[PDB]
Design a protein around this ligand. Structure first.
Ligand SMILES: Nc1ncnc2c1ncn2[C@@H]1O[C@H](COP(=O)(O)OP(=O)(O)OP(=O)(O)O)[C@@H](O)[C@H]1O
Ligand SMILES: O=C(OP(=O)(O)O)[C@H](O)COP(=O)(O)O
Ligand SMILES: [Mg+2]
Length: 408
C-alpha cells in the first residue's frame, strides 16, 4: 500500500464515508457463528467517527445469492445488530443498497451516523452475473453506490480478490484502503517475502471451482501442499479413478489435475491427498455416517464430508515438516460434529507446530471460525479475515480491491 491512499491520510472531517467491508460472516440457525470479520472493520469505522466523519455507510455481500434478493436467508440485518454492540453506537440498517430511497437516507445524515446497507449481491450488477447482467445497469449500480459517500474506503480484505462493482467501480475522487486492508497486506508482505521453508499450503473447503484455479501459481511458491476437504475429490477421481459418490466435484478443474500434478513433480512440491473418509448418506448434520478409503470408494449417493484417521496422520506428517504454513479451507464439514474430527486434529497439529516455532497462518471466513470454535486464535501466528484473498497473495497477485485504490 506504499503508494496507495490509506485512511490515515484521508481528511474525513465533515465528509460522508462510503466503506466497503467484508461482513460475509458465517451463519448457522440464522445466527452469526463468528463476528471476527465484523470486529476487524471496527478500527477503521471508529477512526472515521472520531475524526469527524459526517457518516459511515457500510456495504458488503453475504453468501452467494447470485443476484436475487433473498432476505430470508442472506440478509445483513443480523450484522447490523451485531455491529451495534461492537461499536457502542446504533447503526441504521437499510433494506436495499441502491438507489433512490437508499440515496435519500445517505444524502445528508446526522453527524456521526453509521449506516449498514443490505446485501450487495441481491443485485446482479455487483458481480455482475448470476442467476447475465447489462453494462448500462452495471454503470447505474455503481453511480448509485458512489452517491452514498463523498469519500470511499475499502476495508474489505476478505473480498479484495473480487473485481466486483463495490470493490473496483466506486467513482469518488478519494479511494483509500482502510486499516484492516493495511494490516493484512503488511503482514503477508512480510510473511511471503522470504518464507520459512519447508513452506506448506493447506487447501480445503468447498469453493472448489474457484480455488482449484489458484493451485497452478501456488506451486511456484510452496514446497508442500495438503489438498483436503471438498477439494480432494476432483483430484482423487482423476488420478486414482476413485468412486466419489455425490462428493464435491469440479468438471473444469478435473481437466487440469494432471497438469497440476506434473508441475508439482517438476517443482518438487509434495502433494498430500486424503486416503480415507467419513461418509454421509446426505448433506445433513444428522446424516447416517460411514467410513471409506480411496481403495473402497464412496458408495452411490453417499458423500465424503471428512477425512479419516489415516489421512489425519498423513496431514500431521506434512505439518511436522513445515517451518511455515498457510491454511485456507477446513478439511471437513467442521460445523457438524460428525464431520469435525479431521479439522480438529489438523488444528491440534498446527498449534503444536506453532509452539516449536512454525509460522502458522490460518485464513478465511469459515477457516478462521475453526480457530474461534476451538479457541486457538491466540495459539497460531496469524488468523486472517481473508481466505481466497490470502491464497491470491500467495500466488503473487495484486488484489483488484487494492489495485483500484487511489495512488498517493
Ligand atoms: N468434504 C467436504 N464436502 C463438502 N463441503 C466441505 C467439505 N470439506 C469442507 N467443506 C466446506 O468448506 C466450506 C468452506 O469453504 P470455503 O472456500 O468458503 O472456505 P473459507 O475458509 O470460508 O474460505 P473463504 O474465506 O475464501 O471464503 C465449509 O463450509 C465446509 O463445510
Ligand atoms: O468469504 C470470502 O472468501 P473465503 O470463503 O475464501 O474466506 C469472501 O467474503 C468473498 O466471498 P466469495 O468467495 O463468495 O466472493
Ligand atoms: Mg467460506
Amino acid at each position: 500500500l506504499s503508494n496507495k491512499l490509506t485512511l490515515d491520510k484521508l481528511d474525513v472531517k465533515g465528509k460522508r464515508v462510503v466503506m466497503r467491508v467484508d461482513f460475509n460472516v458465517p451463519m448457522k440457525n440464522n445466527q452469526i457463528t463468528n463476528n471476527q470479520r465484523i470486529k476487524a472493520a471496527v478500527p477503521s469505522i471508529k477512526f472515521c467517527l472520531d475524526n469527524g466523519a459526517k457518516s459511515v455507510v457500510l456495504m458488503s455481500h453475504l453468501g452467494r445469492p447470485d443476484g436475487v434478493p433473498m432476505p430470508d436467508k442472506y440478509s445483513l440485518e443480523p450484522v447490523a445488530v451485531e455491529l451495534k454492540s461492537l461499536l457502542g453506537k446504533d447503526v441504521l440498517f437499510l433494506k436495499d443498497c441502491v438507489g433512490p430511497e437508499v440515496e435519500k437516507a445517505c444524502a445528508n445524515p446526522a453527524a456521526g451516523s453509521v449506516i449498514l446497507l443490505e446485501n450487495l449481491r441481491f443485485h446482479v450488477e455487483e458481480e455482475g452475473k448470476g442467476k447475465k447482467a447489462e453494462p448500462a445497469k452495471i454503470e447505474a449500480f455503481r453511480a448509485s453506490l458512489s452517491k452514498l459517500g463523498d469519500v470511499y474506503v475499502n476495508d474489505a480484505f476478505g473480498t479484495a480478490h473480487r473485481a466486483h462493482s463495490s470493490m473496483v467501480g466506486v467513482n469518488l475522487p478519494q479511494k483509500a484502503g482502510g486499516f484492516l486492508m493495511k494490516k493484512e497486506l503488511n503482514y503477508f508482505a512480510k510473511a511471503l517475502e522470504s518464507p520459512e521453508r519447508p513452506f506448506l499450503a493447506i487447501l480445503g473447503g468447498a469453493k472448489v471451482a474457484d480455488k482449484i484455479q489458484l493451485i497452478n501459481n501456488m506451486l511456484d511458491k510452496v514446497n508442500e501442499m495438503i489438498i483436503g476437504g471438498g477439494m480432494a475429490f476432483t483430484f482423487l477421481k482423476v488420478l486414482n479413478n476413485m468412486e466419489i459418490g455425490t462428493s464435491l466435484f469440479d468438471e473444469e478443474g478435473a481437466k487440469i489435475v494432471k497438469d497440476l500434478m506434473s508441475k508439482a513433480e517438476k517443482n518438487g512440491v509434495k502433494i498430500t491427498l486424503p486416503v480415507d473418509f467419513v461418509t454421509a448418506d446426505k448433506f445433513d448434520e444428522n446424516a447416517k455416517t460411514g467410513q471409506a478409503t480411496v481403495a473402497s470408494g464412496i458408495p452411490a449417493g453417499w458423500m465424503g464430508l471428512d477425512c479419516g484417521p489415516e489421512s489425519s496422520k498423513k496431514y500431521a506428517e506434512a505439518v511436522t515438516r513445515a517451518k511455515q504454513i498457510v491454511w485456507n479451507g477446513p478439511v471437513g464439514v467442521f460445523e457438524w460434529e460428525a464431520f469435525a474430527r479431521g479439522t480438529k486434529a489438523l488444528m491440534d497439529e498446527v498449534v503444536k507446530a506453532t509452539s516449536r516455532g512454525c509460522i502458522t497462518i490460518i485464513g478465511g471466513g469459515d477457516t478462521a471460525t475453526c480457530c474461534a470454535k476451538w479457541n486457538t486464535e491466540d495459539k497460531v501466528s496469524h488468523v486472517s479475515t481473508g481466505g481466497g484473498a490470502s491464497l491470491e497473495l500467495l500466488e503473487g497477485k495484486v488484489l483488484p480491491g487494492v489495485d483500484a485504490l487511489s495512488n498517493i
